[PDB]
Amino acid sequence: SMKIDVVTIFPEYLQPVRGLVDVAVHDLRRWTHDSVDDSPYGGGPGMVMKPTVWGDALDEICTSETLLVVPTPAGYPFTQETAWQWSTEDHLVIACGRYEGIDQRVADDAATRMRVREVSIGDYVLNGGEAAALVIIEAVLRLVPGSLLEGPSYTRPPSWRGMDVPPVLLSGDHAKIAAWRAEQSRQRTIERRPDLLGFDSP
Amino acid sequence: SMKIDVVTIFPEYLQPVRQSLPGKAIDAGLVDVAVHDLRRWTHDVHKSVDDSPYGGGPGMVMKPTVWGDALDEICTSETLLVVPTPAGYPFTQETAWQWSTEDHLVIACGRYEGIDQRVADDAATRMRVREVSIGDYVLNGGEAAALVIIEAVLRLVPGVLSLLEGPSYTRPPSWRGMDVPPVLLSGDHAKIAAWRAEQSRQRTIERRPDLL
Numbered sequence: 434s435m436k437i438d439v440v441t442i443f444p445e446y447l448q449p450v451r452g453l454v455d456v457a458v459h460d461l462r463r464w465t466h467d468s469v470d471d472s473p474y475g476g477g478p479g480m481v482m483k484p485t486v487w488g489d490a491l492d493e494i495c496t497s498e499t500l501l502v503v504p505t506p507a508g509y510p511f512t513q514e515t516a517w518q519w520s521t522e523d524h525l526v527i528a529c530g531r532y533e534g535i536d537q538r539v540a541d542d543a544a545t546r547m548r549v550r551e552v553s554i555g556d557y558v559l560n561g562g563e564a565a566a567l568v569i570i571e572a573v574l575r576l577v578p579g580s581l582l583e584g585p586s587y588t589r590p591p592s593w594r595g596m597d598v599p600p601v602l603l604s605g606d607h608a609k610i611a612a613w614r615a616e617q618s619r620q621r622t623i624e625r626r627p628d629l630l631g632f633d634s635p
Numbered sequence: 636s637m638k639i640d641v642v643t644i645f646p647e648y649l650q651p652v653r654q655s656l657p658g659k660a661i662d663a664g665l666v667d668v669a670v671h672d673l674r675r676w677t678h679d680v681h682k683s684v685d686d687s688p689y690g691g692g693p694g695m696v697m698k699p700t701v702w703g704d705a706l707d708e709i710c711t712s713e714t715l716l717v718v719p720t721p722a723g724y725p726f727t728q729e730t731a732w733q734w735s736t737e738d739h740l741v742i743a744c745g746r747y748e749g750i751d752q753r754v755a756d757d758a759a760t761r762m763r764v765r766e767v768s769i770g771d772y773v774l775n776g777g778e779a780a781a782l783v784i785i786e787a788v789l790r791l792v793p794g795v796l797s798l799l800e801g802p803s804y805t806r807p808p809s810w811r812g813m814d815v816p817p818v819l820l821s822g823d824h825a826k827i828a829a830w831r832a833e834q835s836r837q838r839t840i841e842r843r844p845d846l847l
């Protein structure tokens with residue numbers, strides 16, 4: 434049983450999300466009183482989301498049991514292990530930033546009352562936290578109760594455009610098939626992700 | 636001027652992207668994102684897109700005949716065919732930069748446990764094909780990966796949308812007992828830059844020692 438709350442200034446972006454799990458999307462601007470962003474102290478390009486609005490939003494939504502998830506390019510890596518870890522949480526709150534990010538004090542303040550996880554979903558830059566939220570939600574929820582690269586998969590027909598399914602997969606020999614698949618996995622891993630087997634990246 | 640075609644059995648999942656595009660860029664002909672329902676190319680009354688894996692095992696595999704027809708209609712010789720997969724080459728910022736100058740991206744979104752490998756292998760005999768992973772976690776299908784790829788690429792296309800960056804701060808100068816680091820208000824911009832650099836080094840050591 435999991436509750437997921439997503440906070441964003443673009444709630445519409447989260448529509449792709451659609452009894453053992455409930456997911457709610459909140460418009461951050463609901464906690465304003467008049468602008469959610471301003472220029473950075475110390476200078477630099479772009480804008481930073483003000484801590485004040487976030488503090489009030491999170492005050493209302495989070496408890497001490499909450500795991501606060503903050504997507505950011507500068508985060509710890511979100512991996513499959515992370516997904517397994519979070520899959521048994523009662524309450525995830527995902528704080529989606531925009532512009533150049535969120536004032537650091539939001540996470541620091543929250544960390545005094547709850548567990549906080551700043552995470553990156555990969556080494557590329559998004560325009561905001563929303564797409565990362567969608568990725569995180571999908572990877573976690575598919576694990577809720579209720580390494581190596583996988584090799585190629587095939588289905589019917591056995592011959593297509595003059596391209597044959599590898600004959601071993603048609604042979605019915607479970608041992609020879611398990612062996613071939615293991616080999617295909619290790620070969621693909623060497624080629625595409627040598628780091629997974631402890632080798633230098635290309 | 637970039638065309639993006641996305642093929643998926645869940646076209647509604649890609650709704651955020653098309654909304655995410657400002658009208659100015661579309662009307663300037665800078666970008667056009669089209670989403671296609673894969674079932675348009677099914678052959679049977681049951682609109683079947685999947686079938687059991689050869690060699691056995693769990694899950695299902697998407698049919699090559701359906702995908703073949705779809706890509707035949709949508710792709711040209713100039714297409715960069717992007718196929719999200721947990722087993723793909725890593726999609727990185729360098730990739731996003733490379734793809735940002737492409738004329739035509741076609742993103743083939745799998746579901747179930749993936750697409751019959753002959754689809755990509757056949758396509759690769761007449762166009763450039765890139766099987767890519769967006770991170771070391773498993774999704775339910777290619778659609779979320781397509782969203783990420785589209786967003787990361789398009790924000791690098793003019794006017795369409797190393798160490799870790801350190802913390803950012805804005806008003807107010809004091810909030811819930813926490814002060815903005817005084818150096819940032821010092822007006823010593825050489826010192827500010829060095830402070831930021833050290834924050835960056837520190838954060839990279841703590842969170843991403845792999846980058847060092």
Ligand SMILES: Nc1cc(-c2ccc3ccn(Cc4ccc(CN5CCCC5)cc4)c3c2)n[nH]1
Nearest residue numbers: 504505506530531553554555557559560561562
């Ligand atoms: N794994 C992953 C996570 C994200 C992500 C998550 C939340 C937000 C909120 C705003 N942005 C946009 C954003 C932020 C910082 C910069 C500036 N930085 C300097 C160097 C690299 C970039 C540019 C643009 C997010 C991005 N992207 N990728």
Ligand SMILES: Nc1cc(-c2ccc3ccn(Cc4ccc(CN5CCCC5)cc4)c3c2)n[nH]1
Nearest residue numbers: 719720721745746768769770772774775776777
């Ligand atoms: N970077 C990234 C990309 C994706 C992605 C992309 C396309 C599809 C199409 C179907 N699926 C779901 C899915 C579920 C289980 C298996 C089984 N495999 C065996 C063990 C590991 C997994 C494969 C595939 C996708 C996933 N996920 N993560």
